Amino acid sequence: MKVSEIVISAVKPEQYPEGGLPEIALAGRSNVGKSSFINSLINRKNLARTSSKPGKTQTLNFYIINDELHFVDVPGYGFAKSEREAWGRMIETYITTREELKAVVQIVDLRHAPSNDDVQMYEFLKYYGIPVIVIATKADKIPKGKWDKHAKVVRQTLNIDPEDELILFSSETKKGKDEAWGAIKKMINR
Ligand SMILES: Nc1nc2c(ncn2[C@@H]2O[C@H](COP(=O)(O)OP(=O)(O)OP(=O)(O)O)[C@@H](O)[C@H]2O)c(=O)[nH]1
Ligand SMILES: [Mg+2]
């Protein structure tokens, strides 16, 4: 997509933006680079703020791209890993009351294997039959030669449906860019 502005920081539906526009929201361990992915697709450095390595994103952030879509940035599973569950109620409601939600891009790190939270997430995300675009990120930190031994583990771990799709990615080198935008567009222009 020949592709960039914030709109709001909703903590509940009584805040979600207006317009009834389409949205793709992200789910990911904390620090995984969800805030980064978002930026990588619409070509921004820190529109969605990134951080050294903490738990910087802390609210559902809506980013209207070309006034045609909505990327929604989300805190990592549980921000400060009680607050665990506090996190769910929110992502859940949303992913069960936001009809425009046109799919969830769940991002996991390629290097390691999906943490149960990721299987969990995906599971839930699947119980509601929400289309998902898994993203093996930070490819660039894995010897190009071993991206199969790593990305095979995911598929098995998250045992990803055949309807859903895994994609290798880099917020550094931008690898997986378009693939993302393609799948993301299948979901939008379905
Ligand atoms: N080398 C590398 N670093 C990455 C990559 N993606 C994200 N990072 C680094 O990881 C850190 C956190 O990235 P973010 O995008 O803020 O993380 P996040 O998952 O959105 O974090 P929260 O908003 O707290 O959930 C930063 O220092 C980024 O520069 C990637 O593909 N390669
Ligand atoms: Mg984030």
* Cβ of 171 below 6 Å from ligand 1: yes
Which method resolved this structure?
X-ray
Q: What's the number of domains the chain is made of?
A: 1
In angstroms, what is the span from residue 174 Cα to ligand 1's centroid?
A: 13
Domain that holds residue 99: 1-190
Residues at the binding site for Mg(2+) are 35, 57
Instruction: State this model's resolution in angstroms.
Output: 2.8
* Cβ of 138 below 6 Å from ligand 1: yes
- Ligand 1 atom closest to residue 58's alpha carbon, by position in its atom list: 23
Give the H or E element holding residue 173. Answer: none
Protein residue with its CA nearest to atom 30 in ligand 1: 138
State which residues have CB under 5 angstroms from ligand 2, the bound ion: 34-35, 57, 73
Return the CATH number at 133: 3.40.50.300
Cα separation, 83 vs 165, in Å, equals: 30
Residue 131: which of 141, 122, 140 has the closest Cα? 122
Protein residue with its CA nearest to atom 27 in ligand 1: 52
The residue type found at 3 is: V
Cα separation, 1 vs 140, in Å, equals: 23
Protein residue with its CA nearest to atom 10 in ligand 1: 33
Cα separation, 135 vs 105, in Å, equals: 7
Residue with tokens 């055949």: 162
Cite the beta strand spans of 117-179 per DSSP E.
135-137, 167-168
In angstroms, what is the span from residue 18 Cα to ligand 2's centroid?
A: 22
Strand ranges of the sheet holding 167-168, from the earlier edge strand across to the other edge = 5-10, 60-65, 69-73, 23-28, 101-109, 135-137, 167-168
Spatial contact of 110 and 118, defined as CB atoms under 8 Å apart: no
